[PDB]
């Protein structure tokens, strides 16, 4: 007697349609206000697919309210009318396009994170995805005679649950490409989590995304599996399936990728704070040449990585550059990655205002002596200033305790009192996580992890990477490269609304 | 009352953090320097690149456009204000001359004519060079703080300079002595700009406060309780009734030079507003921040 006989069906259709429409409207209104342009436009396309699904839900609600209690007489008319397969095409298009865009976005994140593509390629793949959605949603519609109104099988007009000509298509779209899409999403986030750990909020966020995807699409896989296994499921069950669990993406993707991310809160806080023709063609040719030149220049500039060098005058600042010159400026290559380490120290000792011009630098390598205790206090002061600086609050600092041998024989000699310059060493015990280094006295370990301790206590009062180095070991370049890879990981996660 | 001007053009050519810019004399052909060691000439009206000079230093700190428009200056920590000639008979732009006579970073070096250029260095000095000889024609000392900015008077007979000494002093181009000493600031000075009349100059420090000094001497101040963040670049309009300061609130703040009120806020930038510029005719405002965008405001 009614298309949605149960009152629960009607009330939640209206609720979920309103939620989907409002979320996608908010995403459209808020996305241009917030890193990466291609990711933003892909989010816009996903929002467009979600609001198309919301429009489908709204039009199904409107058709249901059009015939309330008289749906029995008009049942076969809507069975044969073009409106039913039209809205079925629209729903299938929305679901398929949203799924494909999600896979594209997640694969882009995977290829940027696990292995650390241009505006034209982004437009090409996005338009190709939309056209693929149109073709998939319209091939049953184009061959109307052969497909025997494929979309209009059930009264909901979304053909989830008829003869061979329909079931093959149904299992080709849902069991065929949607399950593979699920595999891609779950494998991609598993690989991202494994690469990040090998902090805690990232795992929680990934769990929420995969849980939303599962709760929306693994029941679809289940019901398609039972339908293909000749297990009887009446059409009212797939009516609830379309009504409740299918629009989950259309409700949650607008609030997940956009509303629950940190840059959304940053934008909210920002808003709160605020509240003849030959000459033209020659110029066009020059613009094309300059644009390809800047394409090559952008590839080159992102290929290299800046590495600021800092420390004390007595510190081993210059010997670090001198050591990897054997391996101001110095360009080197580690694992086919180009690094740009420079030690600007020929200027005055004043450094408050020329240090502001190194904020795109991947890492500030604070290498400082471990032996001179007055210079150790100076290092504590400089590290405090670096950590608490506004523009260095987003820059990772690679802490290097150079001349560890100088400190080792200086405390073995016992000529100078550590307590006189730092009394806390009289009441300090070695950390439990101290690295096992045989052949050296516990006094050296105590003092060395002690100076690590005032460095790290100031740091905890971007991330700091403390290390011990000398002038003998040549492995420091590899450790700097690993730390740079980690910084790449964190800031790439920052660009993709995750961290 | 209110000045609500938006991003009329967006210049997305730059691919790194933009550090300095300078308008040309003909109110077009912006020079813009970025962290990729790139120095790009734009046509403001049609938004098209005509020259892309590869700089020696990626982290360039200052760029300048000559008044004649044939030469462009590049400067940074490398103690050189390199001069490049654009009009080449061979048809390809190439380096022309280098000026290496300092031990501190040239935070800003701006031209007077095709031959002589004044530089403000990081070793507490300024220098007028003549690029025909290559010798530092005149030296300027007397600042006990790291010099960060300088502004050139319209008649180019005086140039004012602001340092980390929290003081701003004039220097004569020829004689080379500081007549007037102004010390009314509170923290390090980061930008300075002559008033269009040439009888005054505004100066933006890191104390989240701008001060307009007049040479008849603290003369005027621009600050508020809500702003607690410094100033990066200060620029004046053609008539001088309007001022724009590149605060590090990730957006420009437009002040009134005479009323010291909140004329407006130019939002739209993601990072520190590195440099600001206003045309000779007062038509357009070019803003360069670290989002690699030249935002034009009209």
């Amino acid at each position, epitope marked *: 007697e009614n298309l949605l006989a149960s009152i629960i069906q009607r009330v939640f259709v209206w609720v979920v349609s309103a939620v989907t429409c409002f979320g996608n409207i908010f995403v459209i209104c808020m996305r241009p206000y917030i890193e990466n342009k291609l990711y933003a436009m892909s989010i816009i396309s996903l929002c467009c697919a979600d609001c198309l699904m919301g429009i489908y839900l709204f039009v199904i609600g409107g058709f249901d309210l059009k015939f309330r209690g008289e749906y029995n007489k008009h049942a076969q008319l809507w069975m044969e009318s073009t409106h039913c397969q039209l809205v079925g095409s629209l729903a299938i298009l929305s679901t398929e396009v949203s799924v494909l865009l999600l896979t594209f976005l997640t694969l882009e994140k995977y290829i940027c994170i696990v292995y650390p593509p241009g505006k034209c390629r982004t437009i090409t793949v996005l338009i190709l995805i939309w056209i693929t959605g149109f073709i998939v949603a319209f091939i049953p519609l184009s061959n109307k005679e052969f497909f025997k109104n494929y979309y209009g099988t059930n009264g909901v007009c979304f053909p989830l649950h008829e003869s061979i000509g329909a079931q093959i298509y149904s299992v080709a779209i849902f069991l065929g490409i949607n399950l593979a899409a699920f595999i891609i999403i779950v494998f991609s986030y598993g690989s991202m989590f494994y690469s990040v750990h090998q902090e805690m909020i990232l795992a929680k966020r990934f769990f929420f995304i995969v849980f939303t995807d599962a709760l929306c699409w693994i029941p679809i896989f289940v019901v398609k599996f039972l339908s293909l296994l000749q297990v009887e499921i009446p059409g009212t069950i797939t009516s609830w399936v379309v009504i409740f669990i299918l629009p989950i993406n259309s409700a949650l993707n607008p609030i997940l990728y956009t509303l629950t991310t940190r840059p959304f809160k940053e934008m909210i806080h920002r808003f709160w704070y605020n509240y003849q023709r030959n000459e033209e063609k020659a110029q066009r040719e020059a613009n094309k040449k300059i644009e390809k030149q800047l394409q090559k220049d952008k590839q080159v500039y992102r290929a290299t990585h800046r590495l600021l060098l800092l420390g004390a005058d007595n510190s081993g600042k210059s010997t670090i550059v001198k050591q990897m010159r054997i391996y101001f400026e110095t360009k080197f290559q580690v694992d086919k990655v180009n690094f740009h380490m420079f030690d600007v120290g020929g200027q*005055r*000792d*004043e*450094r*408050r205002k020329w240090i502001q011009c190194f904020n795109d630098v991947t890492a500030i390598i604070f290498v400082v002596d471990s032996s001179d205790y*007055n210079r150790l*206090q*100076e290092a504590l*002061n*400089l590290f*405090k*200033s*670096i950590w*608490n*600086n*506004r523009w*260095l609050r987003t820059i990772s600092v690679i802490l290097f305790l150079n001349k560890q041998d100088l400190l080792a024989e200086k405390v073995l000699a016992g000529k100078s009192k550590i*307590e*006189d*310059y*730092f*009394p*806390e060493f009289a009441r300090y015990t070695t950390p439990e996580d101290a690295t096992p280094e045989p052949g050296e006295d516990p006094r050296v370990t105590r003092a060395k992890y002690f100076i690590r301790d005032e460095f790290l206590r100031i740091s905890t009062a971007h991330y700091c990477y403390p290390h011990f180095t000398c002038a003998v070991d040549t492995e420091n370049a590899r450790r700097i490269f690993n730390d740079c890879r980690d910084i790449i990981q964190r800031m790439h996660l920052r660009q993709y609304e995750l961290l | 009352g209110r000045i609500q001007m938006r991003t009329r053009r967006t210049l997305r050519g730059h691919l790194a953090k933009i550090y300095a810019m300078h308008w040309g004399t003909d109110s077009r052909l912006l020079v813009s320097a970025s962290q990729d060691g790139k120095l790009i000439i734009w046509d403001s009206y049609t938004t098209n690149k005509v020259h892309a000079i590869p700089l020696r230093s990626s982290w360039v700190m200052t760029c300048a456009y000559a008044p004649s428009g044939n030469y462009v200056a590049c400067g940074g920590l490398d103690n050189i204000c390199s001069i490049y000639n654009l009009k080449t008979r061979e048809g390809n732009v190439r380096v022309s001359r280098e000026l290496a006579g300092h031990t501190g970073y040239l935070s800003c070096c701006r031209f007077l004519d095709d031959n002589q250029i004044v530089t403000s260095s990081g070793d*507490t000095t300024c220098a007028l060079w003549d690029i025909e000889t290559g010798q530092q024609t005149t030296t300027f000392t007397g600042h*006990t*703080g*790291d010099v960060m900015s300088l502004s050139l008077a319209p008649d180019t007979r005086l140039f004012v300079s602001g340092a*980390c*000494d*929290a*003081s701003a002093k004039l220097w004569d181009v020829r004689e080379g002595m500081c007549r007037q000493t102004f*010390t*009314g*600031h*509170e*923290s*390090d000075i980061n930008a300075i700009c002559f008033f269009p009349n040439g009888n005054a100059f505004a100066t933006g420090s*890191d*104390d*989240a406060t701008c001060r307009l000094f007049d040479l008849r001497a603290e003369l005027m101040t621009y600050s508020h309780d809500n702003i*607690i*963040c*410094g100033i990066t670049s200060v620029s004046f309009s053609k008539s001088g009734r309007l001022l724009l300061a590149g605060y590090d609130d990730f957006n420009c703040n437009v002040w009134d030079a005479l009323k010291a009120d909140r004329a407006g806020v130019l939002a739209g930038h993601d990072n520190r507003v590195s440099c600001l510029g206003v045309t000779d005719d007062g038509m357009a405002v070019a803003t360069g921040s670290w989002d690699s965008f030249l935002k034009i405001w009209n």
Partner: nanobody
Amino acid sequence: QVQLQESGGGLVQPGGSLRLSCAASGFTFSNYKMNWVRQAPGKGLEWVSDISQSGASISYTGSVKGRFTISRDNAKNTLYLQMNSLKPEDTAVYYCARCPAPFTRDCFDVTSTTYAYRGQGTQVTV
């Protein structure tokens, strides 16, 4: 004109007491984290004490932690260093340092020279 004036001094027997007053003129004392520095003969500059804007966070160098302490008289816009039982080896000129930027904690006050935010200082002979 940023002015820092050091008051209080005189030769003190080892283990004695004294007061050091850093008076700030031309700027607000509250917004800036402050430091006490001292230059010994034959030695470079070294700031020995730092105190935050509201006085909540106070840190001392090891030669200062157990001997003598610092305080802010923000109403009098001045810094008190309460010299108490100083070792005889620390005969030095006591400079006062204001951090370069307001509303922040980054400070570079150990410049060899040309740091505009340090007073002439007074010579304490202990």
